[PDB]
């Protein structure tokens, strides 16, 4: 995701990065 | 000035100090009290 954010130029400060991190760490809890 | 008190407390202490002098207010025998206040003019500039 961080590499994707680099090519797309995603604002790292934006809340979407936080929510997406949780949207993947919940899977890191899943299995 | 002294580190022990702020100027208002200095004035208060001084006033209470005068009031606590023994027989300071008695005038039966014709006694009197004199409070002299003055400035040491040009004290700093006259230092050799």
């Amino acid at each position: 995701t961080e590499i994707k954010d680099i090519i797309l130029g995603q604002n790292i400060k934006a809340p979407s990065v936080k929510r997406q991190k949780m949207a993947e760490l919940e899977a890191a809890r899943s299995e | 000035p002294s580190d022990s008190e702020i100027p208002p407390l200095l004035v208060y202490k001084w006033t209470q100090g005068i009031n606590n002098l023994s027989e300071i207010w008695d005038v039966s025998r014709g006694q009197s009290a004199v409070l002299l206040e003055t400035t040491l003019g040009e004290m700093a500039e006259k230092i050799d």
Partner: protein, 145 residues
């Protein structure tokens, strides 16, 4: 009233100090609650964060008064040092009572453009007191005009 109350709280503190050593205790921070904001100096100065260094600060009143001869801009509070005296006044109640005197938040806001903002509640009325265009501009190369 500050001096009379100071004589009182500091005599009470002196008595508690002697009992605290008789019991070989330490005085707790909240063993002196209620007196903290009282006395001249304030009782709270006994627990000033830098007291281990301030114990060496001597001639601090005359130093502060003599600042008038070496600095163009001086604090009008030349007569008191918060490190040594503590907070000698607290005006926080004035703001509360002035709001009441003006008729409350409702009456105050009736004088403002608040209703035209469509803002939900007066509670969210957080003025951004730390940013703005003029704050971005003050550092730039600018003429006097």
């Amino acid at each position: 009233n500050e001096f009379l109350d100071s004589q009182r709280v500091w005599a009470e503190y002196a008595t508690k100090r002697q009992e605290a050593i008789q019991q070989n205790r330490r005085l707790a921070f909240e063993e002196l609650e209620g007196s903290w904001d009282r006395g001249i100096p304030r009782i709270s100065t006994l627990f000033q964060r830098d007291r281990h260094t301030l114990a060496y600060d001597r001639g601090h009143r005359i130093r502060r008064e003599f600042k008038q001869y070496s600095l163009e801009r001086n604090s009008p509070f030349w007569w008191t040092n918060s490190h040594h005296d503590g907070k000698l006044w607290n005006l926080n109640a004035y703001r509360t009572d002035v709001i009441q005197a003006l008729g409350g938040i409702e009456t105050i806001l009736e004088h403002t453009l608040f209703k035209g903002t469509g803002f939900n509640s007066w509670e969210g009325l957080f003025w951004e007191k730390a940013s703005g265009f003029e704050d971005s501009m003050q550092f730039k190369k600018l003429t006097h005009a």
